[PDB]
Amino acid sequence: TIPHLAIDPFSLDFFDDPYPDQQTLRDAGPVVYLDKWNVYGVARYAEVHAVLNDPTTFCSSRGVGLSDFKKEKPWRPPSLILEADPPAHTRPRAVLSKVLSPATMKTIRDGFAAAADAKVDELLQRGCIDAIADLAEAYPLSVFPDAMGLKQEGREHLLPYAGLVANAFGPPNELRQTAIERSAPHQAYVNEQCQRPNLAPGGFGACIHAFTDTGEITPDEAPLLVRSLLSAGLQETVNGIGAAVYCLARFPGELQRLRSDPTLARNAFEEAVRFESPVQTFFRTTTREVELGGAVIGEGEKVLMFLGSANRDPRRWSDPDLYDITRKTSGHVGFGSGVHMCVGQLVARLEGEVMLSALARKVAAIDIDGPVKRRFNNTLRGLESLPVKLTPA
Ligand code: HEM
Ligand SMILES: CC(C)(C)c1ccc(C(=O)O)cc1
Numbered sequence: 001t002i003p004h005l006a007i008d009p010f011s012l013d014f015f016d017d018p019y020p021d022q023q024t025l026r027d028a029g030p031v032v033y034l035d036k037w038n039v040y041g042v043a044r045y046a047e048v049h050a051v052l053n054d055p056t057t058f059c060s061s062r063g064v065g066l067s068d069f070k071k072e073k074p075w076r077p078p079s080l081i082l083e084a085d086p087p088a089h090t091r092p093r094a095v096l097s098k099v100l101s102p103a104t105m106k107t108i109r110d111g112f113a114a115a116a117d118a119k120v121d122e123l124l125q126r127g128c129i130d131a132i133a134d135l136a137e138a139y140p141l142s143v144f145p146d147a148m149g150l151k152q153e154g155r156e157h158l159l160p161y162a163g164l165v166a167n168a169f170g171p172p173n174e175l176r177q178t179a180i181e182r183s184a185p186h187q188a189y190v191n192e193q194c195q196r197p198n199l200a201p202g203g204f205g206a207c208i209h210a211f212t213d214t215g216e217i218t219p220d221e222a223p224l225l226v227r228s229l230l231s232a233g234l235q236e237t238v239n240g241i242g243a244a245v246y247c248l249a250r251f252p253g254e255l256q257r258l259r260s261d262p263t264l265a266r267n268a269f270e271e272a273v274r275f276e277s278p279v280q281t282f283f284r285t286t287t288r289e290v291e292l293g294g295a296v297i298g299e300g301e302k303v304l305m306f307l308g309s310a311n312r313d314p315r316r317w318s319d320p321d322l323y324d325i326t327r328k329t330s331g332h333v334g335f336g337s338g339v340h341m342c343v344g345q346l347v348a349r350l351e352g353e354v355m356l357s358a359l360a361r362k363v364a365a366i367d368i369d370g371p372v373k374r375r376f377n378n379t380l381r382g383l384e385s386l387p388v389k390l391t392p393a
């Protein structure tokens with residue numbers, strides 16, 4: 001009754017162009033079985049949304065990668081938020097929500113915007129730049145480590161550690177094996193920066209450590225909560241900003257609309273997150289037998305959610321394969337949905353908004369002027385290099 005498919009969603013060919021295979025996955029049925037990895041798959045919006053919003057049945061504490069923590073040891077100690085279920089998830093989640101709060105965003109917004117404007121001004125002096133290394137990577141690196149309270153030394157480990165974490169959610173393929181082989185220096189750096197003395201006053205990390213006396217978390221939980229922000233706090237936003245620049249380069253009519261109304265910056269970024277979904281896929285594990293999309297799934301089964309596919313499902317979206325900066329983007333699952341929905345999304349959206357606002361006000365044209373290079377990662381979609389010429393307004 002459930003269709004079996006041989007598509008490998010973690011193959012290099014799939015990463016190179018996932019969209020035809022994602023249509024095949026959607027159109028085969030609401031629930032498929034992926035014989036390559038012995039997991040269930042859901043690629044339509046409806047089932048992805050349903051799974052995300054039923055955490056009791058589709059749990060996260062057995063891992064949100066392929067590996068089942070009841071069967072195998074996690075490669076690093078489990079995240080106290082991403083890899084926890086309610087109720088243990090609840091109070092650490094509340095702490096991170098209050099650390100990355102609206103009030104915090106108000107404190108840091110003016111500086112984040114000034115740094116975005118300064119970066120675009122600097123790039124316009126060069127003209128021909130790499131929109132990944134010089135913009136999508138450089139701008140978050142110029143604001144987020146400082147906002148964390150990290151020292152200057154060792155920041156070159158941050159993006160490698162993030163890529164390692166994302167690769168480690170995948171199956172035991174070459175991408176994952178090589179990531180773990182290379183992991184030791186990045187992991188050593190990140191774990192050390194999680195200790196209270198290494199996080200500057202007033203930053204996100206210091207605030208986590210200050211939140212250890214309310215009955216929500218204890219002092220020995222704060223290092224791993226800092227680790228969560230150093231796992232997820234940079235590379236995903238880098239990919240989203242790079243995706244937005246890629247979209248504006250490929251769809252010049254949308255850059256023209258954005259220039260005419262820079263208040264579209266926040267939705268232009270949200271639409272880039274829907275369109276390119278930096279986090280492509282994520283797993284749950286069933287805790288009991290469940291009926292989903294007419295299929296009966298037993299206990300202890302891995303369920304692979306295709307977030308990027310859900311964000312391009314024509315059952316949910318009109319013209320899903322168009323980049324439309326005035327689209328009603330509410331409801332996309334690029335940040336997840338439900339109790340685990342990205343706790344850092346205010347930071348991501350702030351960074352993306354103020355960068356796209358700077359581009360909207362300062363740049364007249366964005367022309368690709370060199371070979372575009374994709375980065376392959378088991379979980380993340382993103383570019384390695386995006387040569388562009390920037391024309392000033
Ligand atoms: C465009 C950028 C980003 C994207 C696309 C993204 C995507 C996601 C997604 C899909 C989830 C849900 C995981 C799940 O349901 O299992 C998530 C959760 C999370 N994200 Fe983000 N994220 C981004 C930026 C950030 C930032 C800037 C931070 C930190 C400052 C962050 C920290 C986290 C954490 C800690 C969680 C776990 C929340 C929980 O389990 O309750 N992310 N993210
Ligand atoms: C952004 C993603 C969903 C990939 C993420 C979230 C949280 C963590 C953590 O370490 O808590 C790691 C990665």
Ligand SMILES: [Cl-]
Pocket residue numbers: 075076077187
């Ligand atoms: Cl680690």
Ligand SMILES: [Mg+2]
Pocket residue numbers: 178
């Ligand atoms: Mg090798």
